[PDB]
Scaffold this active site. Structure first.
Site, mmCIF file in Angstrom:
data_model
loop_
_atom_site.group_PDB
_atom_site.id
_atom_site.type_symbol
_atom_site.label_atom_id
_atom_site.label_comp_id
_atom_site.label_asym_id
_atom_site.label_seq_id
_atom_site.Cartn_x
_atom_site.Cartn_y
_atom_site.Cartn_z
ATOM 1 N N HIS A 1 0.826 -1.165 0.000
ATOM 2 C CA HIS A 1 0.000 0.000 0.000
ATOM 3 C C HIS A 1 0.866 1.222 0.000
ATOM 4 O O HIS A 1 1.657 1.390 0.858
ATOM 5 C CB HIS A 1 -0.878 0.019 1.234
ATOM 6 C CG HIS A 1 -1.724 1.242 1.348
ATOM 7 N ND1 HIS A 1 -2.731 1.527 0.471
ATOM 8 C CD2 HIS A 1 -1.728 2.242 2.246
ATOM 9 C CE1 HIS A 1 -3.295 2.665 0.795
ATOM 10 N NE2 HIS A 1 -2.700 3.122 1.869
ATOM 11 N N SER A 2 0.680 2.112 -0.946
ATOM 12 C CA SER A 2 1.459 3.320 -0.946
ATOM 13 C C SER A 2 2.937 2.967 -1.060
ATOM 14 O O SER A 2 3.329 2.245 -1.916
ATOM 15 C CB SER A 2 1.161 4.108 0.306
ATOM 16 O OG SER A 2 1.491 5.456 0.136
ATOM 17 N N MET A 3 3.762 3.551 -0.231
ATOM 18 C CA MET A 3 5.163 3.278 -0.272
ATOM 19 C C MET A 3 5.400 1.803 -0.447
ATOM 20 O O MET A 3 6.327 1.421 -1.109
ATOM 21 C CB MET A 3 5.859 3.848 0.952
ATOM 22 C CG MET A 3 7.333 3.678 1.005
ATOM 23 S SD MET A 3 7.750 2.151 1.777
ATOM 24 C CE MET A 3 9.246 2.541 2.559
ATOM 25 N N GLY A 4 4.584 0.986 0.192
ATOM 26 C CA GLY A 4 4.615 -0.468 0.027
ATOM 27 C C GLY A 4 4.366 -0.941 -1.398
ATOM 28 O O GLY A 4 4.901 -1.959 -1.817
ATOM 29 N N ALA A 5 3.535 -0.217 -2.138
ATOM 30 C CA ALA A 5 3.268 -0.520 -3.547
ATOM 31 C C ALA A 5 4.519 -0.317 -4.396
ATOM 32 O O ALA A 5 4.953 -1.221 -5.122
ATOM 33 C CB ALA A 5 2.168 0.369 -4.069
#
Lengths: 249, 246
Positions: A96-100
């Site tokens: 998600h977000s930075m995790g993406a």
């Protein structure tokens, strides 16, 4: 009522061994986040998928370790860890977000090393990689950076308020890997990709999430959820994200 | 290793009268609300799972069971209105339970009640295709072997078969002696679920649900036999699919 008896509570679960799991779902948190963002996920997905969240250094029981501020050493450290625990087989990636952004980069890095490729790639609340660089919010003050997270829905908890102060370094180090990143052109991925937008999110608008399409050769779906950049913490769209994951897994 | 700490094993079930949505659930022939155990946990807190326990089973074991679909439909609708569950609801039904769900929806509209947000029908032929079978007439051992071979015997079906044989017969009668009386299509969107190893509710028979609503129709095909609802990969897939539309 005799017609509508309340359901018995589900018996407490023995979570599957990540070794003995048909599939493994490798989950990456948002900037400043920890593995707690994926609390409850195992229960909601069942026993054919072992949820294996990744705790970056600089948080949780890794508070003493220095957080990375550069994306590829991080991605390379991550892949090392995965290869060193035999997770890179019958597996997929959520971020998600930075995790993406981080998910995508680790995907590429496992390709270059010729590691067994992933089943699926999920990314929520994240613009396409080439679109990363223009924001410089890791260079802000604290009160500015507090209010930015607040207006994105990241902190309203007041327990969170406490934990916010403490995790500011790790936030800044997380956000820096997202804004000093500029997309080295490279080929598209062969695995299938699913991207989640949110209606009330500026930082990942439909057109931004749409921009992931040419990043892969396989099947691409953009699900569109309601809510904000931080829906993942709780609510109707966290429930829907999880249900969509359950259909493609 | 420190990269992958094993998370902490994770529940207060929302009040039916408060929740943003009720998902009223109907079991198959000679089944109980037991088939919906685990559901609330898997579906979250925006939806109150309301399994319906028909007369003849569980704590209603000594109550006489309904064996005609239409009076069953009316009693159920009475129970739903009486308990103020007729707003912000959806219906689910597997096999026999699907038909009951469809008929309950039709009774509610007739009475002026607000319409359901969704109708979910699983492992069931379309209404008019009911009435060809006679399983409810078979001998005790013969009927057991039918359900045993369809994959229907944890659940306690196997354990409590002989004790449930009378509600199995009654539930099956209400399906097998059902002749669709014409009424207009519903208006609510409808998802239908069929399974690849299910001889009783084949895709051809499930696809036929399409014209029973003016709203949108979607069929989802899944692995496994007639009793796919009960456990395993196919149950997870069913819950996840349900998740995406609630």
């Amino acid at each position: 009522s005799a017609w509508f008896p309340r359901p018995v509570a589900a018996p407490a679960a023995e979570p599957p061994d990540p070794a003995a799991a048909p599939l493994r779902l490798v989950c990456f948190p948002y900037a400043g986040g920890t593995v707690s963002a994926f609390r409850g996920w195992q229960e909601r997905l069942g026993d054919e998928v072992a949820v294996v969240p990744v705790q970056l250094p600089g948080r949780g029981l890794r508070l003493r370790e220095r957080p990375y501020d550069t994306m590829e050493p991080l991605a390379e450290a991550v892949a090392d860890a995965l290869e060193e625990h035999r997770l890179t087989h019958d597996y997929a990636l959520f971020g998600h977000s930075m995790g993406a952004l981080l998910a995508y980069e680790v995907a590429c890095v496992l390709r270059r090393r010729g590691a067994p490729r992933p089943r699926h790639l999920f990314v929520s609340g994240s613009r396409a990689p080439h679109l990363y660089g223009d924001r410089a919010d890791h260079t802000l003050s604290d009160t500015a950076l507090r209010e930015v997270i607040r207006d994105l829905g990241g902190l309203d908890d007041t327990l969170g308020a406490a934990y916010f102060d403490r995790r500011l370094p790790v936030l800044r180090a997380d956000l820096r890997a997202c804004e000093r990143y500029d997309w080295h052109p490279r080929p598209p991925l062969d695995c299938p990709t699913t991207a989640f937008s949110a209606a009330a999110d500026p930082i990942a608008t439909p057109e931004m999430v749409e921009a992931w399409r040419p990043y892969t050769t396989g099947s691409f779906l953009r699900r569109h959820l309601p809510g904000n950049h931080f829906f993942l913490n709780g609510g109707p769209s966290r429930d829907r994200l999880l249900a969509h994951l359950g259909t493609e897994l």
